[PDB]
Design a protein around this ligand. Structure first.
Ligand SMILES: *[C@@H]1O[C@H](CO)[C@@H](O[C@@H]2O[C@H](CO)[C@@H](O[C@@H]3O[C@H](CO[C@H]4O[C@H](CO)[C@@H](O)[C@H](O)[C@@H]4O)[C@@H](O)[C@H](O[C@H]4O[C@H](CO)[C@@H](O)[C@H](O)[C@@H]4O)[C@@H]3O)[C@H](O)[C@H]2NC(C)=O)[C@H](O)[C@H]1NC(C)=O
Ligand SMILES: CC(=O)N[C@H]1[C@H]([C@H](O)[C@H](O)COC(C)=O)O[C@@](O[C@H](CO)[C@@H](O)[C@@H]2O[C@@](O)(C(=O)O)C[C@H](O)[C@H]2NC(C)=O)(C(=O)O)C[C@@H]1O
Ligand SMILES: *[C@@H]1O[C@H](CO)[C@@H](O[C@@H]2O[C@H](CO)[C@@H](O)[C@H](O)[C@H]2NC(C)=O)[C@H](O)[C@H]1NC(C)=O
Ligand SMILES: *[C@@H]1O[C@H](CO)[C@@H](O)[C@H](O)[C@H]1NC(C)=O
Ligand SMILES: *[C@@H]1O[C@H](CO)[C@@H](O)[C@H](O)[C@H]1NC(C)=O
Ligand SMILES: *[C@@H]1O[C@H](CO)[C@@H](O)[C@H](O)[C@H]1NC(C)=O
Ligand SMILES: *[C@@H]1O[C@H](CO)[C@@H](O)[C@H](O)[C@H]1NC(C)=O
Ligand SMILES: *[C@@H]1O[C@H](CO)[C@@H](O)[C@H](O)[C@H]1NC(C)=O
Ligand SMILES: *[C@@H]1O[C@H](CO)[C@@H](O)[C@H](O)[C@H]1NC(C)=O
Length: 268
């Protein structure tokens, strides 16, 4: 289970439907993808050696996305999917592009980062809403079996990942836009000296600072929520979710900046 709140008993089973896929793609930082711009600093026409929270060059990713229809499996809410956060993660997220009429909608899996996932602890939630990325860090009453839904196409389940009838305490609550037409979003989520940091990009590029949040406590777990739709499967549209994740470590990189301040290259 994720949290301990019984939000639902509708269509729960114990089926072993999948395990996390290992990517045939691997981390290649030679053009700065898998790096980040350092906070609000600009470096121009230079190389620096920088020690930061970076993926290993040549590492695989695990696809942690889960797509449901009516049923959820209890095995989706356990290891290997419920994951130790350690120092942090780099993720490569497929933006799943869906059409209702001719009109485009963007979907992808929510990620939650936390420890015990109960309302005496803060859970960081990063959720898309069709070109708006909502980010919060609140004392959420997380469900046992949390999930999100297609807003775009139908869902035979209602959205249910927390149960708070009046708003929980929040340390952070902000929205960020992203380009709905992109194929990929990238994130770094990491922690250092009791402070969480988030970075993103909506292109094959180094990630840009979203926010930082002091917690004092360690985040110990993360989980990518199942998303349920009457769509995004081989018998209906051949579209899919993918939420690829690879671990970060405290690691020295060479970073190469051009005269515009873009990271053009990096070395592990
Ligand atoms: C922060 O997070 C915590 C932990 O998740 C939340 O605390 C839980 O809150 C829920 C909802 O109030 C509690 O569930 C309720 O417990 C009552 C007491 O349980 C005893 O009595 C029942 C018989 O009534 C026995 O079966 C049981 O074994 C216990 O001996 C129940 O009376 C409630 O019943 C209602 O809901 C159920 C399930 O939907 C229905 O079947 C019933 O018909 C009835 O409608 C209910 O189960 C839960 O016990 C709390 N857990 C703890 C550890 O305290 C906090 O609410 C949350 N805080 C905030 C601010 O959101
Ligand atoms: C994490 C995972 O394993 N995810 C896969 C999912 C589950 O294995 C399945 O849900 C069972 O999960 C549990 C917990 O029991 O199967 C999917 O494929 C199905 C066939 O496997 C799909 O064709 C569905 O077939 C139906 O017969 C049915 O209900 O399964 C009718 C339904 O209308 C139709 N869904 C549509 C149209 O989207 C799906 O989607 O659900 C592809 C997902 O990638
Ligand atoms: C951040 O984005 C979310 C999603 O768009 C906003 O939530 C909506 O807020 C309006 C307020 O009138 C509600 O009517 C909607 O029901 C909400 N939508 C969803 C999907 O939750 C939120 O207000 C935005 N701003 C902040 C600061 O969080
Ligand atoms: C969860 O809540 C539902 C709805 O009230 C109830 O029927 C079910 O018995 C509960 N299950 C558990 C494991 O508490
Ligand atoms: C689920 O199925 C896979 C493939 O057969 C297997 O490796 C795994 O051990 C099974 N059990 C669980 C709980 O994942
Ligand atoms: C960038 O740095 C190189 C190497 O020092 C130098 O040749 C070049 O003239 C510099 N260009 C600018 C615009 O500073
Ligand atoms: C979803 O929400 C509606 C409106 O509250 C409710 O009627 C329905 O029973 C809920 N559950 C499902 C599985 O549709
Ligand atoms: C949005 O993404 C598409 C596909 O990658 C790209 O062609 C387009 O130029 C982008 N637009 C903006 C405003 O970023
Ligand atoms: C999905 O792709 C397979 C393989 O190309 C094809 O046989 C099937 O007809 C496709 N179905 C849909 C709904 O596109």
């Amino acid at each position: 289970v994720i949290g301990d709140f019984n939000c639902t008993n509708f269509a729960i089973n114990d089926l072993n439907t999948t395990v996390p896929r290992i990517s045939e793609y691997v981390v290649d930082v030679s053009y700065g993808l898998g790096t980040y711009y350092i906070l609000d600093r600009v470096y121009l026409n230079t190389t620096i050696l920088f020690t930061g929270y970076f993926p290993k060059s040549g590492a695989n990713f695990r696809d942690l996305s889960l797509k449901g229809t009516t049923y959820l499996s209890t095995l989706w809410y356990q290891k290997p999917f419920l994951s130790d956060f350690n120092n942090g993660i780099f993720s490569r997220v497929k933006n799943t592009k869906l059409y209702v009429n001719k009109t485009l909608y963007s979907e992808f899996s929510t990620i939650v980062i936390g420890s015990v996932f109960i309302n005496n602890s803060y859970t960081i939630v990063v959720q898309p809403h069709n070109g708006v990325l909502e980010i919060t860090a609140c004392q959420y009453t997380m469900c046992e079996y949390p999930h999100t839904i297609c807003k775009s196409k139908g869902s035979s389940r209602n959205e249910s990942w927390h149960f708070d009838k009046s708003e929980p305490l929040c340390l952070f609550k902000k929205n960020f836009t992203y380009n709905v037409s992109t194929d990929w979003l990238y994130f770094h989520f990491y922690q250092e000296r009791g402070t969480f940091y988030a970075y993103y990009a909506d292109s094959g590029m180094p990630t840009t600072f979203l926010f930082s949040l002091y917690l004092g406590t360690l985040l110990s777990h993360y989980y990518v929520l199942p998303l349920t739709c009457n769509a995004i499967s081989s018998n209906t549209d051949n579209e899919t979710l993918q939420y690829w994740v690879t671990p970060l470590s405290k690691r020295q990189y060479l970073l190469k900046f051009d005269n515009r301040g873009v990271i053009t290259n990096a070395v592990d």
